[PDB]
Symmetry: D2
Subunit: 165 residues, 4 copies
């Protein structure tokens, strides 16, 4: 019946586009899809906790979760949904800007049927595949919502190089 | 320097979405991308022959070709571009509605650095992964432009079942 | 029931046969019966060496999973695979997609269109040692399309090394 | 120069060690020097069996490519891999991501965040023989987290078989 599919990788890797590619496939076969997004045949919702969705998710064949790393209870939610027979698809960062794991996404790795880690292109050297997200502005807040203004995806050596200067 | 990446699979598998996912990645690293589409940092063109693009493609780092199976000279074009150092990305059907290969895309398989075959979800049984495109209207024209009105993506056994009734 | 065709392609030295046997082993842990077909001129589950698939007869019907190694040597491979997958077998094929001139094996091209799954593996360039390799370069002088051998006669190369070497 | 960490995860019987050796062999065809590290309690390129990575010393610096099998047994694996990849090695690790209770090996979770590449393989469900399997079920009674063994003590299962069996 149910499964969990997980899409990880650094920023700018196209994780959300891949999540939607998959949702679309299911829609062409007349499956009902429920898309959950974060905020500080089809359906959408922006929420800050998966609790706040209630039981609405049970009306759907496929549940998609975007920015899974911002939801504190995401692993338990996905397991509950997959145990009820849903196809659960999650896009998330695996690593924060210090290359430290989001603990909840780690738990999802252990529970997932499928895991794909996408890469980006290094925004520093423009020559290599990038697996890390470097924060270009000086906060020590773990969560800090932003775009290419505040983050770059970089290859391993550019991450190091920048970490010096 | 150059490569060729090929994305294949039946209709409704999200090949064009994957092609664009990849283009977008390159754009975030400030690479210039040139997108070619068929008709009967960025740039677009609809054309019916790759000849009609001329040498415009040389101004770009990345060349993307959508619906590669409609272009008669696509293999030679891609090889020329990759030999000049371009990253060439092609989305195409590998098989026609009779499960017979597009000969030019076969040639691209042999020349590609990378090949991915995406699947769809079976639009007949809604239960299995689909690798074939079944034409639901009665032409014997190989080329016949259309959507879900005239085609379904199906699994192997649904393809057979329908081929009877 | 649910037959399928899985195809593994790529140049020589890419590990295609290893990937094939990885997949077989998975099935074997679940007690699936697996039959492995190799090519006769080529130099423990149920195994046979044949020079065409017709010489296997109907023996393949006794198995859940049929694995075909060096598929490019068999002239009737597409039809065999389709017949087996229509009978409900999982059919797994390892094959070169391209010959040493980068021209396709036509029968494998047919298989691409019939496959549920296609993976193209790469090797590491054996000329420059720096890039992924997608082509096989023949290092001995023969114009015979078929010429069985190993790293004594072939090497896998990246796109620019293939060109460079072709000038010599 | 261009170091990286490649991680192969999935449950038991998924072929992770075979995939690791597939990758090593590719590198070896391009004459890269490859070093293979196995776990000591565990039951030909340069090979060593150790119970932690610190006991390899600096021997790993003599190779282009470092392969670590059963990474979940090594307590210092993330740091070792990062140090090696920062020195320019290609580091390839095979490991269970989850234990028999479906709880993560924390050190492997760290590696996911540090890896350039992560692949999670599946097995075939050894209970129902019909579905892909992502979990390892321990078939003997031990509450020790670490318990070395094979199909004598474990089987890989799909999500519903894991549940079903857990009731017994
Ligand atoms: C690396 C990051 C990213 N972020 C943010 C930046 C973006 O708003 C978001 C990433 O979007 P993504 O999952 O890649 O579509 O998470 C953090 O809050 N903390 C970190 O350490
Ligand atoms: C299976 C097909 C499809 N087509 C068409 C239908 C669509 O216009 C197009 C597929 O779009 P795609 O590459 O999957 O984005 O090709 C044919 O002309 N002949 C065939 O035999
Ligand atoms: C590239 C090749 C390889 N071969 C042979 C050499 C080997 O015997 C066999 C290996 O292919 P494999 O990668 O094992 O499936 O194919 C040819 O006969 N003609 C060619 O053009
Ligand atoms: C699931 C396991 C497996 N193991 C052991 C059993 C095997 O010796 C080893 C195999 O893992 P592999 O798939 O080879 O990397 O890991 C545990 O010690 N604890 C568990 O919870
Ligand atoms: Mg082989
Ligand atoms: Mg192993
Ligand atoms: Zn870089
Ligand atoms: Zn179907
Ligand atoms: Zn080379
Ligand atoms: Zn099962």
């Amino acid at each position: 019946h149910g499964r969990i599919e997980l899409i990880i990788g650094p920023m700018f890797a196209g994780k959300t586009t891949e999540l939607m590619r998959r949702v679309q496939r299911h829609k062409h076969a007349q499956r009902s899809c429920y898309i959950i997004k974060y905020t500080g045949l089809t359906a959408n919702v922006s929420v800050s906790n998966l609790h706040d969705v209630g039981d609405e998710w049970r009306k759907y064949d496929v549940i998609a979760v975007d920015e899974g790393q911002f939801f504190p209870d995401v692993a338990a939610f996905c397991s509950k949904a997959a145990d009820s027979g849903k196809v659960v698809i999650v896009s998330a960062l695996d690593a924060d800007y210090l290359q430290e794991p989001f603990e909840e996404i780690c738990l999802l790795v252990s529970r997932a049927d499928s895991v794909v880690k996408l890469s980006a292109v290094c925004m520093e050297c423009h020559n290599r595949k990038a697996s890390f997200t470097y924060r270009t502005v000086k906060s020590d807040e773990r969560k800090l919502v932003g775009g290419s203004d505040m983050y770059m995806s970089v290859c391993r050596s550019c991450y190091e190089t920048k970490r010096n200067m």
